[PDB]
Design a protein around this nucleic acid. Sequence first.
RNA 1: GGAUUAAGUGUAAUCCUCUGAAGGUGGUCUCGAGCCCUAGACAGCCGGGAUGUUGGCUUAGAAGCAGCCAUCAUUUAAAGA
RNA 2: CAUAUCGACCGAGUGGCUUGCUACCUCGAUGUCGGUUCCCUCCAUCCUGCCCGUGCAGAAGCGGGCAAGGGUGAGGUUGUU
RNA 3: GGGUAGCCACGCCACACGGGGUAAGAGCUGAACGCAUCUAAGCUCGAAACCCACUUGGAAAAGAGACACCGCCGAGGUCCC
Lengths: 165, 359, 146, 178, 131
Amino acid sequence: RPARCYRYQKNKPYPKSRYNRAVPDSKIRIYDLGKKKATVDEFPLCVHLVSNELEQLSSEALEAARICANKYMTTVSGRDAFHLRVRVHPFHVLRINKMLSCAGADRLQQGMRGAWGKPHGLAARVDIGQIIFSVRTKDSNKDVVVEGLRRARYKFPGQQKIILS
Amino acid sequence: APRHGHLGFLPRKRAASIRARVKAFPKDDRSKPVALTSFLGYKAGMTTIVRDLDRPGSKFHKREVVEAVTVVDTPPVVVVGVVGYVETPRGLRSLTTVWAEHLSDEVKRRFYKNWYKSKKKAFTKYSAKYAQDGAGIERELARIKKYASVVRVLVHTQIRKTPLAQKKAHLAEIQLNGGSISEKVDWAREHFEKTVAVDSVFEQNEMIDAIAVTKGHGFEGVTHRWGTKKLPRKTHRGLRKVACIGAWHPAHVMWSVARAGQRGYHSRTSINHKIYRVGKGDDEANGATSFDRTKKTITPMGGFVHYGEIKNDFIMVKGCIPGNRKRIVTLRKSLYTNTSRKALEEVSLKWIDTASKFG
Amino acid sequence: SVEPVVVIDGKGHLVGRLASVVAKQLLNGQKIVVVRAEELNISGEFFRNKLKYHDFLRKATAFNKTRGPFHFRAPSRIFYKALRGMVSHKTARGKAALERLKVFEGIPPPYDKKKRVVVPQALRVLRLKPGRKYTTLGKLSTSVGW
Amino acid sequence: EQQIEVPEGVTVSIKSRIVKVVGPRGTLTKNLKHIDVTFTKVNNQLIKVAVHNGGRKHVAALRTVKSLVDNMITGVTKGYKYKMRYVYAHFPINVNIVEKDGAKFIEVRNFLGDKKIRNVPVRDGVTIEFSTNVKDEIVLSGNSVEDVSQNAADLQQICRVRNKDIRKFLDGIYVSHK
Amino acid sequence: QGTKFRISLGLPVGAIMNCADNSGARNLYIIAVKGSGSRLNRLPAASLGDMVMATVKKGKPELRKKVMPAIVVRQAKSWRRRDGVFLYFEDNAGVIANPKGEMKGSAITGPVGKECADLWPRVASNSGVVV
RNA sequence: GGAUUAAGUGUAAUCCUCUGAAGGUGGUCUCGAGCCCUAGACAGCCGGGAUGUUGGCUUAGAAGCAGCCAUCAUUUAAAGA
RNA sequence: CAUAUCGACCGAGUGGCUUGCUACCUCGAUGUCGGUUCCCUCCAUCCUGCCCGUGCAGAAGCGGGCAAGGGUGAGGUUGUU
RNA sequence: GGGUAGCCACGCCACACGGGGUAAGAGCUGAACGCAUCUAAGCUCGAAACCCACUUGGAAAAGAGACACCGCCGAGGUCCC
């Protein structure tokens, strides 16, 4: 924190586990919520979660913003309705100033060449319109799930659109 | 900071004239006018008094000492010449005068008895050229048709008997605030031919501003100008020097900040001086008192200060400022600002301290 | 007094629109005065008008010391100043037609004859659907001491 | 624009935007000048006027003008009075009116029952009647409703206190009547 | 409330004066006096009538060390009056007092001023002598 | 010619340089969407807010309105356990 | 009992007091730290004035608003900040 | 060892209120929107803050001021003592 020089893509690939080790584990609980198995897809009421932005939310971003989300999805009696889906994973690894590579801004260090930033965190990135994490059930209430994501958004760097079913 | 000293009086030059010139005058209704709204003579040093407390809500209604203070010697003073002023835009400008054929026999210096032949130095107010009326007419006509402005009178305090003073009289015009105008204009005309005293505009208990040039030395350093901090020890040995004054684009500093210059001298009024007493020197007593033509009530034995004994008309202005000092000339006023209400025609004045200054 | 050429009223009248005229005309040569400075109005108000202006709350006055600059307090100066803007006051026919213009304080104009309005720079303050609170002149310079 | 004609019983006669009203109750005047507006003239009947103008701006005005009049009409014949009671917790309040709003004039004493009286002001031509009994009613009336209004008000508000909370204490006098 | 008597400030901070009795008092030294202001080259000030905060320089008991307060009973510096002109007389003075304002020492050695009584009674009370 | 804006927003292409991101306004104009209306709407506005009965259970209480079960009947112009 | 009060995650900003960066400026030299003295300013207000809320009985508080008129120190250790 | 004058502080004296307009806020009358509404027009109050009041400076304010008297062959002024 804060996430600033973290989620703007001004770099290019990898993740690559070959290349990198010492990746921190994600603190993003399972990306399968609600009752799985049965096809939730048969449902009235629909979806949400549209990013409306560019990218790279960190696992710190998604994992408390998503279960936060689920927490107020609990209202629908624990195990009784909806499945929650998350889309993208936090693959993508980021490195931060370890003074040896270059100079100035991050992904630059001291000297020239040298320490790339040391591994510290991972974040998935997204596009202008992608569905961050969706799923629904019949209109349980007015739309508790719609209330969900109200809270879900408001912990994402992006401005997420609710998007109607 | 707070800033040292206080802007207010500015720039802080020397003082032109060693006579105060009141900027403002009381504004009045139900008034004569005085002509001599201001009237003054000047300082002798002073002792203290025991006074009955006046009329407070407070319990103290008994003897209590206040600095009966700097008794100044006044008066009588004469107003020779009421001067009209009339018409703007611009500002006030004199009209014509009046006159007086009385001429205190000493008002030559700084006045009359100038050499008949012109002198390089400008001549002061002297007159043998007289037109009492004409002046009166000029004023009256420039009343109905044009205008007029507040009228005042010349005044001159005589040194009938003061320690070390002379025929020289240094007097300045004091304004008369009557009712409409024309009523008052009449008043200043009556008190023209004639003379006055403090017991005219005045009253014990009544509050008055007092004005005069402070006594004081010439240029001094920052510390005892507006106060400034001395030190620190380095240039401690040297005179107190304030940190650099202003630094930036203007090389010079207007500053408004701590500069060496003249001090002493002044010209500043004080506000709401109470006038505890009025007085005299002639003997008057409710009961038997000393005889053999005793002297003034309040003058210390041993005289007071350099210029001693008082034996004539006095005034006591408590908590003496006086806004100047020894044998100078303060000017009285009326209390323009006022705060507390007036007290009484007289104060009890149970005791006055008479003792040689030294000792 | 000053010789008028075309004296101009300025009552309900937007100030700049007037002084953006007489400071054109002034330039050409014309001599004269606007009166009713005092009722001469600029729109938008009762706030960022009091401030960023000359009130003793505007702090325009009492702004500084030996550096200035100082502004004006009277309705005369206040939009006299406006006149200097829109003129190359410093030099040439600048401070020329500049001097040759005066604004007068006034209730109905102090000089005998009503002076002309300008090409429509009028308040039109009546059933101001387009109008809103706009009040200035004396009032700004009244909150500030005269 | 609009035209208001009324009433008989009350005259009009406005000149140079001063405006007026008549009687029998006393008359009120109101400048009513704003923007190019006619400042309504009496048209040998009743006054009502419009200025060629635009949309909303003048329109907010020459609407308001209509309401200022028509409440000047009723403020001249059958005046306007507001009426309401005083009363609260222990010990009564002393309301009484002496001439003028001035301090130690316009009423109220022991608010709760405090020392020092607090009350002002009164409007230009308003009358303050008093309680029927010891104290339990006030009548405020006057021709103009714009003086009579914030007389009864500004007499209710002169009870309002920002301290504990209104809930705990409910003193004061309110003009419930309109 | 009002002293009703003008007083010049005889002693500033760091001044050493004599307690006219507390218990184990001795000579307290002045530390800032009541709510007071300051200016450049302030020199705090104090004078008869003004409550002062102080430390016990001399002592005996473990009074010495410090804390306070005490009120200055007498001062060497002039006064004022209501009647005459007034005095300064004795040496300076001071008696420790509690926040109540009562003395924290039964007897007060030395005299006391009249309008010190007015400010605080009890102090004047166990005077022994006034005037 | 037309429309919006009431904040002096703004009168700032680009940028170290011109900030503003995830305070308020039934001032006014313009555009869209849902529902309700001449079986008469809003105000829509104005006024009113039945008996067994506090239904059974539960509970400290549970009286239309924590929760579970039931949701009948009466008197009605009408009014749900 | 979100919103008396405390208040995470995430998101948007403002300031230019700290720190870092610039290696852009100066190596024909822009005198160090701390202190002192003397002037001005900032907020985003510690007290005082006038207010709102309260988990405000009162008293004492807690939190918030307007507000910069005035006020807001003395000592022991340490060169110390 | 004592100490006059003077100069001084450690000595002594004096240093409001009140009025006007506001902020936060408390209200009045009051529509848009028949009701309600402290606000949109209007209004009554309301801060140590703002203006005045009060002290100080100030005809070089270039619109460079006003008044009275004296004076142009002598009014006054400089030098002198």
